[PDB]
Design an enzyme around this catalytic site. Structure first.
Site, mmCIF file in Angstrom:
data_model
loop_
_atom_site.group_PDB
_atom_site.id
_atom_site.type_symbol
_atom_site.label_atom_id
_atom_site.label_comp_id
_atom_site.label_asym_id
_atom_site.label_seq_id
_atom_site.Cartn_x
_atom_site.Cartn_y
_atom_site.Cartn_z
ATOM 1 N N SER A 154 1.248 -1.044 -0.233
ATOM 2 C CA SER A 154 -0.062 0.026 0.362
ATOM 3 C C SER A 154 1.085 1.291 0.005
ATOM 4 O O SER A 154 1.181 2.193 1.453
ATOM 5 C CB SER A 154 -0.640 0.071 1.326
ATOM 6 N N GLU A 167 6.646 -17.195 20.626
ATOM 7 C CA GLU A 167 6.310 -16.626 20.034
ATOM 8 C C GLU A 167 4.750 -15.990 20.209
ATOM 9 O O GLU A 167 4.324 -15.537 19.664
ATOM 10 C CB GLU A 167 6.461 -16.120 18.995
ATOM 11 N N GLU A 180 2.579 -17.566 18.703
ATOM 12 C CA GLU A 180 2.203 -17.550 17.261
ATOM 13 C C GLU A 180 1.371 -19.267 17.303
ATOM 14 O O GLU A 180 1.666 -20.084 17.885
ATOM 15 C CB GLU A 180 3.361 -18.169 16.728
#
Ligand code: 5GP
Ligand code: 5GP
Ligand code: MG
Lengths: 201, 204
Positions: free
Chosen positions: B127, B156, B158
């Site tokens: 973007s 982490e 995750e």
């Protein structure tokens, strides 16, 4: 049904499965840098601890691919995007028409408005392409793309008219390499034959 | 045809850190040539700096299957039905690393996948009006029968679930909006445009 076993009950989890504990805005200028604190369900069954993530917040956009179905041409707008500088040969990019969506506005109204203001193009029919998250690991930004029927002969920003085939070849070659334009032009390469038939009836 | 101006036509005068955290927000101060033949005044823009990424489309050309990874992306929350997204394997490119090194490491860490041959797809700016981020996509040859289960580094925080779909199924999910993040859309549209030649090349 607590004695019912787990197996007797696409994506796995919904908004009921996440709790956003807190949001803070750490920087506010033209854009914002926000901090979300949240916990969420884990695939193994439990709940996570509290997680914190920075989120770049800049609102959301409408994007218009101007396509001339009579001429098989697209209209591109060129302007400088300084953020491209560090990873690109030039910061001037070839892009789709686009603008921010304000409160209560529709994607179509913004797309049509910007097409007239950036490229001087009157738009006839529109069709949705796709609505995508630009980079959801770090930004909330969503962009909603339409294709808009234009007469390309009527086309700090500079307007370029090229054949669809040339525009797509520039995607292949990396000369058009911003997400909105790549997505729009790949979609056009997959759908142009039917779209030209639909719009030249 | 093509763009009009080069780096000879823009001067970045300074950059100022507006926010310094896990990511950064920088103010670029610059001047540049105008299409009307003049020079701009001093322009500023706020730019989100978060490094750059490698992205892997894991494609099994024998089975015509794609491996997707599911995980929460909280930034999706405000505009999406759910913040859990179906995505491509991906990770940040650290100093000195190659796109392939990162893609292979993330394929193992996020999906338990070894990768065979690889080819570039495309490298794109996510973007560029507001972020410098570039993502470089590869397609990687995988055996989708080896893709299953829950992965990600628990330390982490995750938590990643592997999904296997046919290519046509993944593309249908793009059309329907069930896959709607840029990296995955770009990769899967590319795959729809190139799968015939890619399968022939990798099944010889
Ligand atoms: N503290 C912190 N860590 C982050 C943030 N965004 C990503 N990370 C870290 O980046 C890794 C995963 O990033 P991902 O590839 O999922 O975007 C994890 O180590 C995670 O903790 C953030 O905003 N703040
Ligand atoms: N004028 C101005 N706009 C900025 C700056 N940083 C971010 N922006 C945002 O960029 C928008 C313009 O985006 P553009 O029309 O160039 O795509 C502005 O309306 C504003 O929200 C800055 O330093 N100056
Ligand atoms: Mg990872």
């Amino acid at each position: 049904m607590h004695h019912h076993h787990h197996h007797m009950s696409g994506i796995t989890f919904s908004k009921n499965d996440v709790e956003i504990i807190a949001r803070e805005t750490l920087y506010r200028g033209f854009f914002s840098l926000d901090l979300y604190r949240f916990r969420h369900r884990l695939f193994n069954g439990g709940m996570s601890g509290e997680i914190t993530r920075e989120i770049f917040e800049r609102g959301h956009a409408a994007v218009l691919l101007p396509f001339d179905p009579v001429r098989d041409e697209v209209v591109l707008v060129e302007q400088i995007r300084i953020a491209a500088y560090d990873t690109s040969e030039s910061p001037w990019l070839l892009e789709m028409v686009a603008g921010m969506i304000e409160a209560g506005e529709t994607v179509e109204d913004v797309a049509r408005r910007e097409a007239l203001e950036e490229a001087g193009l009157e738009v006839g029919r529109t069709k949705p392409i796709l609505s995508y998250l630009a980079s959801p690991g770090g930004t909330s930004e969503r962009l909603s793309i339409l294709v808009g029927e234009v007469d390309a002969s009527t086309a700090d920003i500079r307007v370029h008219v090229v054949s669809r085939e040339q525009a797509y070849q520039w995607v292949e070659e990396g000369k058009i390499d911003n997400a909105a334009s790549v997505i729009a032009l790949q979609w056009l390469q997959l759908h142009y034959h039917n779209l030209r038939n639909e719009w030249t009836k």
